[PDB]
Design a protein around this ligand. Structure first.
Ligand code: CLA
Ligand code: CLA
Ligand code: CLA
Ligand code: CLA
Ligand code: CLA
Ligand code: CLA
Ligand code: CLA
Ligand SMILES: CCCCCCCCCCCCCCCCCC(=O)OC[C@H](CO[C@@H]1O[C@H](CO)[C@H](O)[C@H](O)[C@H]1O)OC(=O)CCCCCCCCCCCCCCCCC
Ligand SMILES: CCCCCCCCCCCCCCCC(=O)OC[C@H](COP(=O)(O)OC[C@@H](O)CO)OC(=O)CCCCCCCCCCCCCCC
Ligand SMILES: CC1=C(C/C=C(\C)CCC[C@H](C)CCC[C@H](C)CCCC(C)C)C(=O)c2ccccc2C1=O
Ligand SMILES: CC1=C(C/C=C(\C)CCC[C@H](C)CCC[C@H](C)CCCC(C)C)C(=O)c2ccccc2C1=O
Ligand code: SF4
Lengths: 73, 63, 80, 742, 87, 146, 34, 160
């Protein structure tokens, strides 16, 4: 999404549903993912892009840092 | 006791339906120990449908 | 369970006792009215909380007053 | 012992009782003191048992109220015949009905509403009617509008007669209590005199008037040159040229040569291929048979001539080892309580109206009834709503009989006492079968929605997935199609076309009827129907059975019928009353009847109604989507509630735009209902106290104190707007869609 | 029907469908079931290995499942569907 | 009303034809037809008998909202003592059914209390209301981008 | 996706096992006589 | 004449109907493993488990999601055994909540007649403990034997 924010749907998280048939796995695979995923409509990609986060490692480091912040709280 | 029988009084009791309303005194009990001797009749009923209520002389003024 | 309180505005009209379906209210002697009797709630642990006494009280505002508090198997009205 | 007991001038015909509004009730006779007096004025207006304790004056009030109702219905019929006479295109429709829509209401050109006078055909502008009066008058043999005007003024004469009889049987000669308690004579004169002689008189009309005129209407004869109905009676050779059995002249009737009446009294079955409606030789044999059968059944009971039955002797001999002293005192129930008889009569009239709805889409009795799809949908929908309302009112007056007329001293160890003695078992097992039906129908719908959403069409309940074919219905439909060959010989065809006997009837290029398929979708929606009817029975029967008392409130009969609650005690006793069970059964009647008419509309728009082109191809309105989309709620929302609502919302700027306006205003009345249903009295009372303060500030306080509506009244107003808004929503959507695609 | 000598018989404490038969099996069948179901007796012990054993047995066949066994481990088998506006 | 106005003022802006909103928002049949009916074309066709699309979870969540919201009506219209007598009959049925009477309750089964009934109906009303609109709003803009 | 099998593990535990842990431990806790 | 009150008492909430106190029904209900008041509650809990274990293979192999494959024996039996293990924990937490360790039996000691019987040991903390293990061993063996008779031996039936 950072390479092309106009033609890539932002992916929230992957889906692991035991109740999908093959049309549901083949239809929820969006954004060039390897499986059925949920498209993020929360504007977190636009936010994290504008603020300076670019790679997945920066978001992972932010997730560990806020795990530490919630642990401190 | 009481202001007068057959007189117009205004209720100062906060929790009554007829607060700041014109009422007509129909009976005052002169027996000692009665807390609310003055019986006041009103032209309008409350939500219970009655118009007769007993008030103390401290909760009424002549109007 | 439920707390039923009688206030000094009561005229001793007895209809709060007559409307009571679980025998909570009784008329005790008193010196503050023409009828010389006031209600009381000795068996207030048997009170369902139906407020039939408040519906039958002609005093404005009400002399019998039921406050819904902690509810037990008496005040829930169950048979099982 | 049966004879006329009346007495002369009970009440003087005076207007001094008109001036006092609350004269009937002792509480309302003191005049108003709050604004709730107005609502109890209307609530206790018809409640004659709450006025007096004397059943004689109550029965006189009910008799004159029946006469006033008959006057209102005759005024209504006078209006509908006057609208046919003056404001219709009935002669234009009668010239050719396959292209001209039935219309009998002209609006006034005032505020832009003159666009509602649409092009219905025949050089006429007006509201296209869906009441079926045009096909009814075609089946009655009405050829001109002078006959409609004569029937309108005759109905006005009968309405004046019902008003005169309502005044007469309350103010001049009103009957006494033992006159109304002669139920054996009343049944003898309703079975023989009313339903027997009425069927015989309509059979005579359908021998002399309906049959030859409707035979000439099948021949393409213009109705202006068709001979008038009395010319068949006068010139019997004119009647004999259409049926040679009339040349014998009433001698085969008294010599028992009834088979020589086989020309005009037939057991054909099916529909007329010219018109699409039942045969009138069959409808005249039908009425002659139900007349020679209701007149036989009207000679059953014992009045004063020795022969007959005392029905107390019928009841008191019906006693069993599983009941003991059953059926005893039920005569004393049904002759001393108006509400018990009202419960039975309302249950039979509502169930009968549901019978009428099914026996009219399936066996259309009137010429060009089936091919005018608007009439069929509106007649079925109207009779389903009337039938559901009357069965909810049946349970209502059953509950009023319990709370106000059930005497426990006269009913010991009979059927009613034992039904009250095990009402927990009845309501609990009804509760179990309702929950079982709810899962095994609606959770099957939820399962189909889930596997259709999850991309598993093979894991559903479809005709292609796991099948649930209604083998009992699919066998009873084959039993009713393969009947004429062996079990019902003397029939030319079969009873209905919807059974499976072929006969693709095409009238005007539109499908009248054909074999109705029954598959997995019909199984699912019939189990929805059984579930919703059972739950409506559950609330209504719970209100009937727990009207006297409960485990919760053992003194519920002292509280009455229209009481809100006991209070917030026992956890809360909100809606304990039997009235509140009628109130909730009104919603469950909405749910039941609305899914019934939705299944009807989609089932026949998908599998029955349509058009026939050349070489026998049938194109339906929504082609074949009931078998695949009516198994999921998304199909019901999508291919029924969205696809067929594409003519009620873009009808604006056309003649059907009043259906769009009432569709939206019906949504308004429904969302207005949710204000009264979800809220309660005390909030509105304190808001009215603030408004009364604002009125006291500007000295515009009324002496009639503004009050919030009562809790029973707030629930009544909410359920009245809920039924009115939702029923008007379905009325507007139905009458826009099936007029637009019909 | 009140007795003041038998309070259970006058209140509804009835074994309505019970039986007082001491035994109807034999000793060979009874000794087999108590031997095998002897480690399943204690409620605190049985709740421990059912939670811990139940968490492992759903994570095993959740992970060792194949494409034909479960469609979520099969993955996509066709080209992805492109949405509107080129997204 | 606010988010209906937002989503229809923007759903006509984003595909260009603001004249649809400028002609149709002044009357409620335009709101019903050109907004609630027109934008729900690919919402409820998220799954069909023919197949299912990527909006299918948004087509189920729309129907799901119409369940829960309407389920709230069950708590907001029907009130307590009907259900209390119903649960009294259910308690009798469990206490008299053979093989099921052996199982007891420690909590006595009662109906939902009056404040609890208003809260449960309100929360169902709110969950259905937020899920019917979250689905419609995230399926009538993300399936017809613009 | 980095590790595709943790979807296959945590969704069964937090979807089936963890409600069966939480609701059974709460039902013990809410019906303790204490 | 046919309907009686429950043991002659009209004020107990029940009736002696033919569906309740028949010669055939009251013979049946008195021999079912749940109403044996003197049998040890682990032994009669094995019969309550064998029964329910067996019957539940049927709706899980003929209606489940993997019903159209060759793994329909393996998928539905482990699904049937999964409902045994859940209901064992539902039986476990019921006996923890309802019965306390060291208490008496919450059971009616008196029979239909006036004879005094011993207390039913199933409604105890230790009686429901052995009943839960009886359902677990009986249920897992009732599933496995119904799986053996359907998808190992493969006996001929119209639907399987
Ligand atoms: C004009 C002639 C006349 C007069 C002066 C009287 C005199 C009396 N009548 Mg009446 N009565 C008459 C004709 C007459 N009646 C007729 C025609 C009927 C048959 C319906 C009866 C049957 C009758 C009954 C059974 C009762 C009386 C009683 C009464 C008393 C007052 C009731 C009242 O308030 O009436 C005013 C009533 C109205 C204005 C309502 C009339 C409603 C009519 C029928 C139309 C209803 C449908 C209409 C289309 C509205 C539908 C809704 C609308 C929005 C579309 C009074 C002694 C009552 C009595 O003495 O008991 C104490 C009583 O119970 N009357
Ligand atoms: C053979 C005689 C006979 C017939 C035809 C009827 C017919 C009728 N009765 Mg009646 N009745 C009779 C005798 C008869 N009754 C007897 C002997 C008893 C006393 C035990 C009763 C007591 C009784 C009561 C208490 C009531 C009726 C009512 C009804 C009406 C049914 C309701 C309706 O809408 O029907 C369809 C209605 C019509 C078709 C309208 C027809 C009206 C015309 C003018 C005929 C009625 C007059 C008279 C009964 C028969 C005259 C025959 C004439 C045509 C030659 C209907 C008018 C009910 C009603 O509505 O009250 C007014 C009502 O509940 N009846
Ligand atoms: C209540 C209904 C009714 C009434 C008023 C009539 C009236 C008439 N019928 Mg009849 N008729 C009826 C029922 C009726 N019928 C039915 C249902 C059948 C089938 C059996 C017929 C078949 C019939 C025939 C075959 C003939 C009449 C004839 C007559 C006429 C002389 C008999 C008479 O008035 O007495 C008269 C116009 C005769 C007539 O003049 O025909 C017009 C004639 O020949 N009737
Ligand atoms: C054969 C028909 C029949 C009979 C004889 C009666 C007779 C009676 N009913 Mg009713 N009942 C029936 C069928 C019938 N009902 C049906 C159809 C229902 C289901 C709705 C019920 C449900 C029932 C209950 C719930 C109760 C009764 C009660 C009453 C009694 C007096 C009501 C009153 O004063 O009117 C009052 C009339 C009105 C308030 C008029 C309002 C009309 C409706 C509700 C709204 C308007 C509808 C209209 C079509 C929409 C137009 C809108 C437009 C104006 C904008 C009386 C015994 C009451 C009672 O106490 O019985 C003893 C009562 O508690 N009825
Ligand atoms: C869509 C809205 C909705 C739903 C879900 C319900 C649900 C219920 N109503 Mg209804 N009802 C509603 C609106 C609703 N109602 C409103 C508008 C009112 C107010 C007037 C009523 C008031 C009410 C009355 C007064 C009565 C019912 C009763 C019932 C029950 C019917 C039996 C049944 O179907 O069991 C099956 C349950 C369902 C179909 C609900 C969905 C559950 C799914 C299928 C299960 C899967 C979920 C899964 C376990 C999650 C994990 C059921 C619990 C009746 C009752 O309780 O006795 C039977 C009763 O008498 N209703
Ligand atoms: C509240 C925050 C939040 C929420 C809404 C979810 C939501 C989700 N997680 Mg999770 N996740 C979280 C926190 C969050 N996550 C964090 C902080 C971590 C980093 C260690 C993870 C790591 C993680 C893994 C490794 C997996 C998921 C997965 C999932 C999905 C299934 C649930 C599951 O198995 O949980 C598993 C949860 C955990 C392993 C840890 C959860 C810890 C949170 C903070 C507890 C919050 C409690 C909450 C405040 C109480 C209310 C679901 C979409 C699965 C997935 O992708 O599905 C395909 C999966 O494989 N999660
Ligand atoms: C996140 C929640 C969660 C998850 C992970 C699943 C997972 C599953 N569901 Mg389920 N379901 C759930 C919530 C859950 N469900 C809820 C809330 C609803 C109610 C609306 C449903 C309603 C539902 C039904 C109606 C059915 C499914 C079925 C399925 C299975 C589909 C995959 C398949 O084809 O396997 C095919 C089957 C198997 C491979 C059999 C495996 C069974 C294992 C071996 C059980 C072993 C013991 C167990 C782990 C003990 C648990 C202990 C406890 C701590 C949790 C799968 C096991 C179907 C099924 O087959 O169920 C088993 C089915 O019939 N679901
Ligand atoms: C024909 C329809 C008119 C019928 C009127 C019958 C009637 O009430 O009048 C019969 C009334 C009976 O007279 C009544 O007498 C009472 C005292 O006993 C009161 O005065 C009533 O107001 C008065 O109506 O006779 C009249 O005096 C006629 C005037 C009222 C009729 C006005 C018609 C408008
Ligand atoms: C519908 C048929 C259901 C069968 C019912 C039927 O056959 O009734 C048989 C039985 C008839 O009892 P008796 O022999 O006492 O009946 C004599 C009759 O004349 C009633 O007075 O009715 C009942 O006891 C009701 C039982 C309903 C049982 C629940 C059914 C629901
Ligand atoms: C709105 C509302 C009210 C208030 C309703 C009222 C006050 C009825 C209003 C009736 C009319 C509008 C007022 C009377 C109109 C007079 C005829 C004066 C005419 C003035 C114009 C209409 C011409 C309740 O009392 C209530 C009670 C229980 C549950 C819900 C509710 C509820 O929702
Ligand atoms: C249906 C209904 C009931 C019966 C409802 C009951 C007994 C609720 C219990 C049924 C099951 C247990 C609900 C399960 C649904 C949820 C999954 C529960 C989740 C709660 C947790 C999050 C705490 C009432 O008691 C009632 C009372 C007052 C007004 C209306 C109603 C009413 O409509
Ligand atoms: S009803 Fe009210 S006024 Fe009358 S005795 Fe009771 S408390 Fe006193």
């Amino acid at each position: 999404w950072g390479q092309d924010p106009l033609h890539v749907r932002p992916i929230a998280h992957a889906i692991w549903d035991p109740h999908f048939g093959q049309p549901a796995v083949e239809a929820f695979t969006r954004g060039g993912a390897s499986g059925p995923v949920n498209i993020a409509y929360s504007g977190v990609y636009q936010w994290w892009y504008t603020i300076g986060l670019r790679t997945n490692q920066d978001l992972y480091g932010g997730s560990i840092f806020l795990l530490f912040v919630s642990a401190l709280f | 006791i009481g202001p007068k029988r057959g007189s117009i009084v205004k209720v100062l009791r906060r929790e009554s339906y007829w607060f700041n309303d014109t009422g007509k005194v129909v009976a005052v009990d002169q027996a000692p120990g009665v807390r609310y001797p003055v019986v006041v009749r009103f032209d309008k009923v409350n939500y219970a449908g009655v118009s007769t209520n007993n008030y103390s002389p401290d909760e009424l003024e002549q109007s | 369970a439920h707390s039923v309180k009688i206030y000094d505005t009561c005229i001793g009209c007895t209809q709060c006792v007559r409307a009571c379906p679980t025998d909570v209210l009784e008329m005790v002697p008193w010196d503050g009215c023409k009828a010389s009797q006031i209600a009381s709630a000795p068996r207030t642990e048997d009170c369902v909380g139906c407020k039939r006494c408040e519906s039958a009280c002609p005093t404005d505002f009400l002399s019998v007053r039921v406050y819904l508090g902690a509810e037990t198997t008496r005040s829930m009205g169950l048979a099982y | 012992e049966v004879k006329i007991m009346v007495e002369k001038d009970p009440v003087k015909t005076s207007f001094e009782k008109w001036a006092k509004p609350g004269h009937f009730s002792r509480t309302l006779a003191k005049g108003p003191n709050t604004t709730t007096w107005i609502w109890n004025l209307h609530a206790d207006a018809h409640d004659f048992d709450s006025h007096t304790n004397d059943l004689e004056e109550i029965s006189r009030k009910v008799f004159s109220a029946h006469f006033g109702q008959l006057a209102v219905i005759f005024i209504w019929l006078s209006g509908m015949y006057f609208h046919g006479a003056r404001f219709s295109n009935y002669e234009a429709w009668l010239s050719d009905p396959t292209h001209i829509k039935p219309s009998a209401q002209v609006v006034w050109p005032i505020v832009g509403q003159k666009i509602l006078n649409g092009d219905v055909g025949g050089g006429f502008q007006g509201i296209q009617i869906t009441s079926g009066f045009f096909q009814l008058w075609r089946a009655s043999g009405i050829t001109s509008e002078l006959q409609l005007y004569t029937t309108a003024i005759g109905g006005l004469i009968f309405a004046a007669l019902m008003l005169f009889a309502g005044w007469f049987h309350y103010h001049k000669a009103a009957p006494k209590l033992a006159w109304f308690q002669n139920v054996e004579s009343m049944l003898n004169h309703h079975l023989a005199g009313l339903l027997g002689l009425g069927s015989l008189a309509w059979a005579g009309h359908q021998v002399h008037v309906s049959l030859p005129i409707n035979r000439l209407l099948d021949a393409g004869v213009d109705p202006k040159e068709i001979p008038l109905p009395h010319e068949f009676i006068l010139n019997r050779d004119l009647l004999a040229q259409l049926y040679p059995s009339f040349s014998k002249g009433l001698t085969p009737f008294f010599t028992l040569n009834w088979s020589e009446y086989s020309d005009f009294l037939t057991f054909r079955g099916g529909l007329n291929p010219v018109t699409g409606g039942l045969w009138l030789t069959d409808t005249a044999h039908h009425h002659l048979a139900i007349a020679v059968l209701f007149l036989v059944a009207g000679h059953m009971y014992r009045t004063n001539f020795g022969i007959g039955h005392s029905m107390k002797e019928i009841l008191e001999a019906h006693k069993g080892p599983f009941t003991g002293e059953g059926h005893k005192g039920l005569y004393e129930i049904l002759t001393t309580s108006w509400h018990a008889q009202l419960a039975i009569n309302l249950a039979m009239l509502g169930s009968l109206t549901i019978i009428v709805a099914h026996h009219m889409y399936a066996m259309p009795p009137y010429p060009y009834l089936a091919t005018d799809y608007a009439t069929q949908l509106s007649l079925f929908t109207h009779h389903m709503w009337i039938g559901g309302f009357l069965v909810v009112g049946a349970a209502a007056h059953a509950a009023i009989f319990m709370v106000r007329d059930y005497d426990p001293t006269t009913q010991y160890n009979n059927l009613l006492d034992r039904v009250l003695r095990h009402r927990d078992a009845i309501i609990s097992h009804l509760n179990w079968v309702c929950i079982f039906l709810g899962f095994h129908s609606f959770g099957l719908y939820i399962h189909n929605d889930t596997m259709s959403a999850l991309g598993r069409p093979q894991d559903m309940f479809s005709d292609t997935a796991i099948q649930l074919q209604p083998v009992f219905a699919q066998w009873i439909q084959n039993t009713h199609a393969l009947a004429p060959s062996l079990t019902a010989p003397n029939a030319t065809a079969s009873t209905s076309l919807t059974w499976g006997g072929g006969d693709l009837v095409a009238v005007g290029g539109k499908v009248a009827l054909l074999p109705i398929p029954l598959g997995t979708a019909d199984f699912l929606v019939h189990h929805i129907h059984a579930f919703t009817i059972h739950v409506t029975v559950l609330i209504l029967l719970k209100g009937v059975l727990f009207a006297r008392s409960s485990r919760l409130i053992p003194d519920k009969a002292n509280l009455g019928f229209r009481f809100p609650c006991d209070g917030p005690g026992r956890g809360g006793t909100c809606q304990v009353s039997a009235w509140d069970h009628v109130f909730l059964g009104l919603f469950w009647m909405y749910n039941a009847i609305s899914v019934v008419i939705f299944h009807f509309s989609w089932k026949m728009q998908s599998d029955v109604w349509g058009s026939i082109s050349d070489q026998g191809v049938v194109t339906h309105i929504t082609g074949g989507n009931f078998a695949q989309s009516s198994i999921t709620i998304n199909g019901w929302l999508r291919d029924f509630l969205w696809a067929q609502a594409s003519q009620v919302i873009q009808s604006y700027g056309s003649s059907l735009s009043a259906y769009g306006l009432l569709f939206l205003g019906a949504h308004f009345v429904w969302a207005f209902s949710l204000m009264f249903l979800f809220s309660g009295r005390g909030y509105w009372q304190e808001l009215i106290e603030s408004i009364v303060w604002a009125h006291n500030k500007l000295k515009v306080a009324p002496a009639i104190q503004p009050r919030a509506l009562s809790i029973v009244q707030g629930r009544a107003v909410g359920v009245a707007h809920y039924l009115l808004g939702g029923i008007a929503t379905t009325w507007a959507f139905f009458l826009a869609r099936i007029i637009s695609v019909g | 029907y009140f007795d003041l000598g038998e309070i259970d018989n006058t209140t509804g404490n009835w074994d309505l469908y019970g039986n007082d038969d001491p035994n109807r099996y034999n000793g060979f069948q009874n000794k087999f079931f108590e031997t095998f179901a002897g480690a399943f007796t204690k409620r605190g012990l049985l709740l421990k290995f059912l939670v811990l054993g139940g968490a492992t047995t759903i994570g095993y066949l959740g992970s060792t499942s194949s494409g034909d066994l479960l469609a979520i481990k099969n993955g996509p088998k066709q080209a992805p569907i492109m949405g509107p506006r080129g997204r | 009303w606010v988010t209906f106005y937002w989503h229809w003022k923007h759903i006509t802006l984003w595909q260009g034809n603001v004249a649809q909103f400028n002609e149709s928002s002044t009357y409620l049949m335009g709101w019903l037809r050109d907004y609630l009916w027109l934008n729900s074309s690919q919402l409820i066709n998220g799954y069909n008998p023919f197949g299912m699309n990527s909006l299918s979870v948004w087509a189920w969540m729309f129907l799901f909202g119409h369940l829960v919201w309407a389920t709230g009506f069950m708590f907001l219209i029907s009130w307590r003592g009907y259900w209390q007598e119903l649960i009294e009959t259910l308690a009798w049925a469990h206490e008299r059914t053979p093989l099921a009477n052996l199982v007891r309750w420690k909590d006595k089964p009662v109906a939902l209390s009056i404040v609890q009934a208003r809260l449960v109906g309100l929360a169902h009303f709110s969950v259905g209301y937020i899920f019917t609109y979250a689905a419609f709003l995230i399926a009538s803009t993300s399936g017809k981008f613009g | 996706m980095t590790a595709s099998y943790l979807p296959s593990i945590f969704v069964p535990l937090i979807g089936l096992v963890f409600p069966a842990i939480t609701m059974a431990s709460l039902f013990i806790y809410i019906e303790q006589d204490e | 004449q046919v309907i009686e009150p429950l043991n002659g008492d009209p004020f107990i909430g029940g009736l002696e109907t033919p569906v309740t106190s028949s010669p055939l029904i009251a013979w049946y209900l008195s021999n079912l493993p749940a109403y044996r008041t003197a049998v040890a509650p682990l032994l009669r809990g094995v019969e309550i488990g064998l029964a329910h274990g067996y019957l539940l293979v049927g709706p899980f192999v003929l209606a489940g999601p993997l019903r159209n494959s060759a793994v329909r024996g393996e998928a539905g039996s482990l699904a049937a055994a999964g409902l045994v293990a859940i209901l064992t924990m539902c039986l476990t937490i019921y006996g923890i909540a309802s019965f306390k360790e060291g208490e008496a039996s919450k059971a009616p000691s008196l029979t239909l007649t006036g004879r005094q019987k011993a207390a039913d040991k199933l409604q105890t903390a230790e009686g429901w403990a052995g009943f839960t293990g009886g359902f677990f061993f009986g249920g897992l063996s009732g599933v496995a034997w119904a799986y053996i008779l359907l998808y190992v031996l493969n006996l001929p039936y119209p639907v399987k």
